[PDB]
Amino acid sequence: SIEWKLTANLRNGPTFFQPLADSIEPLQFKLIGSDTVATAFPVFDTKYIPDSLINYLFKLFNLEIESGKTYPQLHSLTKQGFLNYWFHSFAVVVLQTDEKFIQDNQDWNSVLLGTFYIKPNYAPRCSHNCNAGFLVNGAHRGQKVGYRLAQVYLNWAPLLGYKYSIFNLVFVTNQASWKIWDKLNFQRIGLVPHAGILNGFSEPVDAIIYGKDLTKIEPEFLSME
Amino acid sequence: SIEWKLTANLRNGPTFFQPLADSIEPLQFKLIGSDTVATAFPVFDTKYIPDSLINYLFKLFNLEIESGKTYPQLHSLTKQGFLNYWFHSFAVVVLQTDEKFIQDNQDWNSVLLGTFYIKPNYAPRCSHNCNAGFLVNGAHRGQKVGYRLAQVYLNWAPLLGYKYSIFNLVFVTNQASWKIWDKLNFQRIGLVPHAGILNGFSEPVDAIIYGKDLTKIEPEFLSME
Ligand SMILES: O=C(O)[C@@H]1C[C@H](O)CN1
Numbered sequence: 001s002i003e004w005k006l007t008a009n010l011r012n013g014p015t016f017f018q019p020l021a022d023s024i025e026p027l028q029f030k031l032i033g034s035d036t037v038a039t040a041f042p043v044f045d046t047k048y049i050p051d052s053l054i055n056y057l058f059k060l061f062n063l064e065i066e067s068g069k070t071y072p073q074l075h076s077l078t079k080q081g082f083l084n085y086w087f088h089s090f091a092v093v094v095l096q097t098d099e100k101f102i103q104d105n106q107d108w109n110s111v112l113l114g115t116f117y118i119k120p121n122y123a124p125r126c127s128h129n130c131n132a133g134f135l136v137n138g139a140h141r142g143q144k145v146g147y148r149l150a151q152v153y154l155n156w157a158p159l160l161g162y163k164y165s166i167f168n169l170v171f172v173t174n175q176a177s178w179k180i181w182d183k184l185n186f187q188r189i190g191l192v193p194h195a196g197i198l199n200g201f202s203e204p205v206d207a208i209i210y211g212k213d214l215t216k217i218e219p220e221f222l223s224m225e
Numbered sequence: 226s227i228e229w230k231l232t233a234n235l236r237n238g239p240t241f242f243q244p245l246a247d248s249i250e251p252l253q254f255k256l257i258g259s260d261t262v263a264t265a266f267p268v269f270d271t272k273y274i275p276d277s278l279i280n281y282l283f284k285l286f287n288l289e290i291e292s293g294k295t296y297p298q299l300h301s302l303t304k305q306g307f308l309n310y311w312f313h314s315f316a317v318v319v320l321q322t323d324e325k326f327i328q329d330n331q332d333w334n335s336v337l338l339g340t341f342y343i344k345p346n347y348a349p350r351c352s353h354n355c356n357a358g359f360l361v362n363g364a365h366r367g368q369k370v371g372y373r374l375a376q377v378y379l380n381w382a383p384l385l386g387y388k389y390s391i392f393n394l395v396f397v398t399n400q401a402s403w404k405i406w407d408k409l410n411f412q413r414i415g416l417v418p419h420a421g422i423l424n425g426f427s428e429p430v431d432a433i434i435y436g437k438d439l440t441k442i443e444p445e446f447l448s449m450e
Pocket residue numbers: 070071072131132133134166167168169170
C-alpha cells in the first residue's frame with residue numbers, strides 16, 4: 001500500500017492547480033559534509049505516522065515556541081492545536097535512516113532530523129502561494145539540516161501544485177534562516193519593520209518576507225548529491 | 226449606557242499593548258467635496274448593532290467576493306462564517322447620518338456607506354501589527370468613501386493599541402492602491418508577483434503589501450476637515 005504517499009489524499013491544498021505527480025517517493029540523501037544518510041517522507045495524514053513521532057513533534061514545536069525567537073506564537077499549543085496547525089495540509093518528516101518507510105517506536109530524539117509543513121499561504125484565489133515552517137531537532141544542530149530541509153521543500157512544493165513560495169516572517173535575528181533563503185535564491189520581497197516582540201531582545205525585531213518562483217527552480221538546488 | 230464603545234470590551238486584540246483610550250466616540254465628518262454628513266461608529270460586538278445591519282453587511286461582503294476582483298476568497302461565506310470573519314476583533318460601520326448612535330431598521334442600502342474590520346495580522350508576538358479590510362457600498366461609489374474610511378482607520382487603530390498596519394494583498398488592479406494608500410503614505414513594503422487569480426483577468430495579478438507606522442501619522446491625514 002502506497003496510500004500514505006498519494007497526492008490524491010492531499011487535504012486543504014491549492015484550489016486552482018492539481019498536483020504534478022500522483023505520488024511523492026521518499027527522498028534519500030546524505031547530510032552535508034557527512035556520510036550520514038537521511039530520508040524525507042511525505043505526510044498527507046497523521047494516521048500514516050507513528051503516534052510516538054507525532055507526540056515527539058508536538059513537544060519539539062512547543063520548545064521552539066518557548067524559546068520565543070523564531071515563531072510568532074507566545075504560548076504553547078495543546079495537542080489538538082498542534083495537529084490542526086502542523087498538519088493542516090501537507091508536512092514532511094526527515095529521519096536519520098536509509099529505510100524507505102517509517103518504522104514505529106524509534107528513538108526520535110536521535111532519529112528525527114527535522115520537519116516542515118506546507119500549506120496555502122492565503123485563501124483560494126491566492127492559494128497557489130504556499131507557506132512553510134521548519135524545525136530542526138536541537139540534538140542535530142550544527143549539521144546544516146535546515147539547508148537540506150529547504151531543498152526537499154523546493155523538490156516537493158511544486159509537486160503539490162504550488163507556483164510560488166512565501167515566508168511571512170523571517171526575523172532578521174534568525175540568521176540561521178535568512179542565510180539559507182538567501183543562498184537558495186529566495187528573493188526578499190518585503191520587509192516588516194519592528195514586526196516581532198522576541199524573547200531576549202529588548203527592541204522589536206524586523207521580519208523579512210521571502211518569495212520564490214516554484215516553476216523555475218535552479219537545478220543545482222534541487223540536487224542533494 | 227456606553228458599553229458599546231468601551232475598549233475594555235475589545236475582543237481578540239493585540240497581546241502586548243493596551244488601548245490608549247477607555248472609549249471610542251463616533252467620528253463625524255463630511256464626504257469629500259460635499260456637505261453630506263457621515264458618522265463612523267465602533268463595533269466591539271455585533272450584539273450592539275441591529276440584526277438587519279449585520280444581514281445587509283453579510284450580503285454586501287458576499288457581493289464583493291462574487292465579483293472576484295478584490296478579496297482572496299472564492300466562495301460566498303455562510304452567515305456564521307461572515308460573523309467569524311468580519312467581527313473576529315474590531316469593526317467599523319460608517320453611516321450617512323448625523324446621529325451619534327445607530328438607529329434600528331434603517332434603509333441600509335442608502336444609509337450604509339462603508340465598513341471595515343481591524344484585527345491582529347499575526348499571532349501574539351507580532352500582534353501589534355493590525356490588518357484591515359474595507360467595503361464600500363456600491364451605491365456610494367464615486368464619492369471617495371474609501372479615502373474617508375481609511376482616515377477613520379488611521380484615527381482608531383492606534384487607540385486599540387496597534388503600532389503598525391499591514392495589508393497583505395492589495396492587487397495592483399485595485400484602484401484603492403493609488404487613490405488611497407499611496408496618498409496617505411502607506412509605504413509599499415513588498416510585492417507578491419502573480420499573487421492572485423482574479424475574475425476577468427487571464428494572467429495572475431500582482432499584489433502590493435502595504436505597511437504604515439501607526440504611532441507617527443501625518444496630522445493632515447488624521448484631520449477629517
Ligand atoms: O515565516 C513563515 O512564514 C514561517 C512560518 C512561521 O511563522 C515561521 N516561518
